[PDB]
């Protein structure tokens, strides 16, 4: 029994007790909205792990802007991740390895990334720490 979203239960046609349930819907602004923000973190924490094993398995050192790095991730993962979701991947990877990835802002709204040495053993040990912190 695996995940199979296919059932005939959807679209089956056909006092003040139910009014109290609508009052509890106001609590979803801090619970359902907070769960939506945590759902995007699950698609960013485990998604940035394979990204570091894709870009660093290629070039290094040379400067790379934010517009050039965003088009390379989408083109390599189209078989997807949009343009807005690709910008949050490189932003979350800076907090994990601040000594390996250098970010220098440009006066005009441009970010250039640069990395010297990217070790796979160091990133594998730090990926399990960031994944366990979001689960608590």
């Amino acid at each position: 029994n695996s995940r199979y979203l296919a059932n005939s239960k959807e679209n089956f046609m056909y006092q003040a007790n139910l009014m109290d349930r609508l009052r509890e819907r106001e609590r979803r602004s801090a619970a359902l909205l907070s769960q939506r923000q945590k759902r995007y973190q699950q698609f960013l924490a485990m998604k940035m792990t394979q990204v570091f094993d894709i870009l660093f398995s290629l070039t290094r050192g040379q400067p790379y802007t934010e517009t050039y790095l965003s088009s390379l991730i989408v083109d390599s993962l189209q078989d997807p991740i949009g343009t807005k979701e690709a910008s949050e991947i490189l932003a979350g990877l800076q907090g994990i390895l601040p000594m390996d990835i250098s970010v220098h802002q440009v006066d005009g709204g441009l970010k250039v990334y640069r990395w010297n040495s990217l070790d796979k053993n160091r990133f594998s040990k730090l990926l399990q720490i960031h994944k366990s912190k979001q689960q608590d």
Binding site: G61, P63, S102, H104, R114
Partner: peptide
């Protein structure tokens, strides 16, 4: 100074 930081 920006050439050393960016690496161009």
């Amino acid at each position: 100074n920006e050439m050393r930081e960016l690496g161009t």
